[PDB]
């Protein structure tokens, strides 16, 4: 029970990595607000986690929806100890084909949404004066550009930068800002990525997946439970001297 009596807000928590972080945090004795744009999906997730979980509808692309969501969580819990910025969209396209629509929608969620949710947590944690924890979900894609993934890579590079900036600015208020950079994650996350590479190569139905998996030094694609240990550790006092860092949990797919 490494988070006993702590309160957390996780964005994009209805499914995949965010749902798994909410589960693990409840198992460590935290109260968790699960935020997602889809009220039905986040109601269902809360129903699967039990009475330590609460559902919040939030569109992280809109300031008024951010302020209302935070107001609701603070109203219910009284205070917020931990923000996990996990909401993200994927897109792929050669730079010469990227549309304003895809650009705008991936930047609004991955970068701007993460920034202003971090700001909302930060303002609440400064006012309270008891510190807190902010964990941004970055990506291997944030460490180096790749062809076809310019928009996604740039959004995650900005998440790593804002983790650093906010980390050095907020540590004097006892707020630890850090990031986790997953590698290639299996199942539902992979399928999001795979669906955006259809128009380009699509090399043979499902061979791409075992190749990318085979090429991960560890020998498989990631599962959500590879990340939960790091998500818990960064929210504990054993990590109070860790400030502004991005930790690769990627089976050796990247080195930092």
Q: Which of residues 218-247 bind a second copy (CB under 8 A)?
A: 218-219, 222, 226-230, 232-233, 236-247
Residue 44 or 63: the one with the smaller Cβ distance to a second copy is 63
Residue 42 or 109: the one with the smaller Cβ distance to a second copy is 109
Decide: is 116 part of the binding site for a second copy (CB under 8 A).
Answer: yes
Q: Which of residues 175-194 bind a second copy (CB under 8 A)?
A: 183
Decide: is 170 part of the binding site for a second copy (CB under 8 A).
Answer: yes
Q: Give the one residue of 145, 187, 191, 214 binding a second copy; rule: CB under 8 A.
A: 145
Q: Give the one residue of 96, 101, 199, 205 binding a second copy; rule: CB under 8 A.
A: 96
Can you tell me the distance from the alpha carbon of 82 to that of 90, in angstroms, rounded to the nearest whole number?
Answer: 25
Question: What token pair was written down for 16?
Answer: 């995949």
Decide: is 65 part of the binding site for a second copy (CB under 8 A).
Answer: no
Decide: is 103 part of the binding site for a second copy (CB under 8 A).
Answer: yes
Can you tell me the distance from the alpha carbon of 35 to that of 54, in angstroms, rounded to the nearest whole number?
Answer: 9
Q: Give the one residue of 155, 184, 193, 235 binding a second copy; rule: CB under 8 A.
A: 155
Contacts of 185 by beta carbon, 8 Å cutoff, 6+ apart: 16, 17, 221, 222, 223, 224
Candidate list 25, 103, 152, 241, residue with the active-site label: 152
Mask 76-95, x = binds a second copy (CB under 8 A)? ------------------xx
* Smallest gap from residue 41 Cβ to a second copy (A): 27
Q: Give the one residue of 42, 166, 184, 193 binding a second copy; rule: CB under 8 A.
A: 166
Provide the sign of the torsion angle of the four alpha carbons 246, 176, 163, 5, taken in this order: positive
Which strands, in side-by-side order, build the sheet including 31-36?
53-57, 31-36, 7-11, 82-85, 132-137, 175-182, 246-249
Q: Give the one residue of 15, 164, 192, 208 binding a second copy; rule: CB under 8 A.
A: 164
Q: Give the one residue of 115, 117, 189, 193 binding a second copy; rule: CB under 8 A.
A: 115
Residue 17 or 55: the one with the smaller Cβ distance to a second copy is 17
- Our answer to whether residue 152 is catalytic in this structure is yes
Contacts of 141 by beta carbon, 8 Å cutoff, 6+ apart: 149, 152, 153, 156
- The answer to whether the CB of 234 falls within 8 A of the CB of 242 is yes
- The answer to whether the CB of 10 falls within 8 A of the CB of 34 is yes
Q: Give the one residue of 42, 88, 111, 184 binding a second copy; rule: CB under 8 A.
A: 111
Residue labelled with tokens 């650093």: 164
The H-or-E segment that residue 114 falls in is helix 114-128
Q: Which of residues 194-213 bind a second copy (CB under 8 A)?
A: none
Residue labelled with tokens 């540590």: 171
Residue 238, number of CB atoms within 10 A of its CB: 11
Question: What token pair was written down for 167?
Answer: 């980390």
Residue 25 or 247: the one with the smaller Cβ distance to a second copy is 247
Question: What token pair was written down for 38?
Answer: 């889809």
Q: Which of residues 123-142 bind a second copy (CB under 8 A)?
A: 123, 126, 142
């Amino acid at each position: 029970m490494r988070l006993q009596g702590k309160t957390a807000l996780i964005t994009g928590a209805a499914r995949g990595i965010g749902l798994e972080f909410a589960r693990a945090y409840i198992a460590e004795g935290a109260r968790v607000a699960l935020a997602d744009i889809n009220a039905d999906a986040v109601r269902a997730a809360v129903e699967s986690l039990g009475p330590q979980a609460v559902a919040v509808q939030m569109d992280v692309t809109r300031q008024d929806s951010i302020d209302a969501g935070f107001a609701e969580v603070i109203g219910t819990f009284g205070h917020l100890d931990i923000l996990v910025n996990n909401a993200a969209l994927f897109t792929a396209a050669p730079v010469e084909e990227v549309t304003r629509a895809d650009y705008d929608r991936v930047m609004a969620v991955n970068m701007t949404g993460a920034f202003f949710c971090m700001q909302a947590a930060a303002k609440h944690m400064i006012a309270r004066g008891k510190g807190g924890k902010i964990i941004n979900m970055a990506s291997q894609a944030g460490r180096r550009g790749e062809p076809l993934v310019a928009v996604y890579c740039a959004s995650k590079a900005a998440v790593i930068s804002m983790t650093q900036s906010a980390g050095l600015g907020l540590i004097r208020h006892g707020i630890n800002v850090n990031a986790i950079a997953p590698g290639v994650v299996d199942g539902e996350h992979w399928d999001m990525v795979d669906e955006h590479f259809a128009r380009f190569e699509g090399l043979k139905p499902g061979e791409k997946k075992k190749l990318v998996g085979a090429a991960v030094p560890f020998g498989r694609m990631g599962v959500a439970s590879d990340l939960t240990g790091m998500a818990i550790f960064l929210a504990t006092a054993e990590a109070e001297y860790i400030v502004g860092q991005t930790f690769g949990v990627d089976g050796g797919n990247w080195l930092a």
